[PDB]
Amino acid sequence: MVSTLKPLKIGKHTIKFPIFQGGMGVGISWDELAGNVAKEGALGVISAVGTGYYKNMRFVERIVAKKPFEALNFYSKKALNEIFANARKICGNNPLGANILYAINDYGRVLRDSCEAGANIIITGAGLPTNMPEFAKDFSDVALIPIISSAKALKILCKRWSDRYKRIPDAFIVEGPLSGGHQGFKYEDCFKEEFRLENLVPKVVEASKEWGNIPIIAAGGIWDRKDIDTMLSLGASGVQMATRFLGTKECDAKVYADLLPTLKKEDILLIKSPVGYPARAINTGVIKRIEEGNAPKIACVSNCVAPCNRGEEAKKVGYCIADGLGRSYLGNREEGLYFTGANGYRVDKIISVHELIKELTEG
Numbered sequence: 001m002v003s004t005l006k007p008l009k010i011g012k013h014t015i016k017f018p019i020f021q022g023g024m025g026v027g028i029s030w031d032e033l034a035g036n037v038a039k040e041g042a043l044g045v046i047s048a049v050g051t052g053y054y055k056n057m058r059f060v061e062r063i064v065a066k067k068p069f070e071a072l073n074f075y076s077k078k079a080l081n082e083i084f085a086n087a088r089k090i091c092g093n094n095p096l097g098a099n100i101l102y103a104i105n106d107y108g109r110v111l112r113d114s115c116e117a118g119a120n121i122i123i124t125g126a127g128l129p130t131n132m133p134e135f136a137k138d139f140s141d142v143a144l145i146p147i148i149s150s151a152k153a154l155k156i157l158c159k160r161w162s163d164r165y166k167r168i169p170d171a172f173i174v175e176g177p178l179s180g181g182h183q184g185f186k187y188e189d190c191f192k193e194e195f196r197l198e199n200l201v202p203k204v205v206e207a208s209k210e211w212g213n214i215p216i217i218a219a220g221g222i223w224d225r226k227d228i229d230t231m232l233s234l235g236a237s238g239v240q241m242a243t244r245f246l247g248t249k250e251c252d253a254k255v256y257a258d259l260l261p262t263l264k265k266e267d268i269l270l271i272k273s274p275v276g277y278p279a280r281a282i283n284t285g286v287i288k289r290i291e292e293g294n295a296p297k298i299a300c301v302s303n304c305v306a307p308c309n310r311g312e313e314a315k316k317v318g319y320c321i322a323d324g325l326g327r328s329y330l331g332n333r334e335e336g337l338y339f340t341g342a343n344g345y346r347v348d349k350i351i352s353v354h355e356l357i358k359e360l361t362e363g
């Protein structure tokens with residue numbers, strides 16, 4: 001209960017601790033995880049990606065081959081609404097974010113869906129989101145946070161937003177190459193010291209000075225309070241952490257509670273992705289199936305990302321990311337796809353969100 005970490009202001013919202021749990025798709029950070037995180041005084045973040053899979057397609061209008069048909073069902077408005085409602089049964093009106101990737105054409109529809117579902121903050125990476133305020137003008141209080149890989153992106157985002165909307169972002173998350181999910185770096189750049197998060201945070205904070213010290217949130221490879229203090233001492237206003245929350249009981253993808261305590265470092269690797277950025281995966285499930293020559297059949301049903309072009313890139317890289325992550329949420333160990341931050345192998349015990357926040361904030 002006693003902490004020397006100070007509350008963090010994001011636009012019109014305040015969180016007791018300068019900690020986000022990063023959004024995790026598919027079905028990894030929904031109502032149980034995000035709700036309990038926000039209950040603890042950190043920012044809980046609901047993933048808006050693949051919400052059609054929620055409760056095995058409870059809220060989809062059409063299913064083909066056990067998959068949500070097209071993007072209107074893959075990004076399901078009614079599912080998102082119920083995930084927020086269920087989260088607020090736990091955290092009340094404590095702030096919640098919605099994470100939505102940029103590399104869908106339907107971006108504005110899902111952003112307004114998140115706003116209408118009750119999100120207080122929108123977080124967007126997997127691209128350069130120069131038009132977030134376009135879709136949010138009906139919701140003046142929702143804070144808007146791009147995820148960036150570099151100071152150059154910060155400067156462009158601020159100029160494009162300022163010129164077009166007379167608004168700048170409420171915060172920036174800078175994500176480094178030790179992160180889970182996709183990486184904002186070329187494969188070869190992920191191993192180079194110049195792009196280590198400790199090197200990126202100073203540059204982004206310095207870039208932020210010119211626009212009035214927009215808060216910078218450091219993400220990627222942050223494990224414990226010592227890493228938090230390191231990032232804060234480098235100018236960051238807070239941290240976003242995901243892999244630690246991936247290893248909590250309240251994670252909405254229950255498979256991880258069985259998979260992570262066995263996870264070995266040599267079984268974590270960067271792979272290709274239909275999204276067009278390197279993804280950090282666990283060497284199991286669909287990956288192993290591909291290497292055996294038993295790859296699941298590919299045929300675009302959910303139309304989940306624009307860069308894929310309805311299966312072109314999925315066929316080239318060998319797997320459909322929607323199908324694989326959805327199968328993991330539904331419990332499929334043989335054909336599911338599984339993601340992790342570089343630190344995933346350090347998960348031994350599965351602990352509660354409450355004990356994890358205690359660990360991260362005590363003192």
Ligand SMILES: CN(C)c1cccc(NS(=O)(=O)c2nnc(NC(=O)c3ccc4ccccc4c3)s2)c1
Pocket residue numbers: 025026049050101124125126127128147148149175180181182183184185275277304305321322325
């Ligand atoms: C700022 N830029 C260019 C950039 C690039 C890469 C990473 C980052 N950093 S990041 O936005 O924090 C992210 N890390 N992982 C991400 N994964 C996803 O979006 C994702 C997860 C599951 C899906 C399932 C189905 C369809 C789409 C899916 C998309 S996004 C920034």
Ligand SMILES: Cc1cc2nc3c(=O)[nH]c(=O)nc-3n(C[C@H](O)[C@H](O)[C@H](O)COP(=O)(O)O)c2cc1C
Pocket residue numbers: 021022023024025028047049099101124125126147175178179180181182219220221222240241242243244246339340341342343
């Ligand atoms: C399993 C998993 C799934 C993720 N999926 C997403 C996602 O859908 N959208 C996103 O913006 N970030 C995603 N991320 C990135 C996290 O939100 C976060 O920025 C990053 O993992 C922080 O690094 P850490 O895991 O070392 O704390 C994912 C991370 C993990 C581990």
Ligand code: SF4
Pocket residue numbers: 274299300301302303304305306308309310311312314319320321322323
């Ligand atoms: S085939 Fe490509 S666009 Fe279609 S659902 Fe799979 S990854 Fe998404």
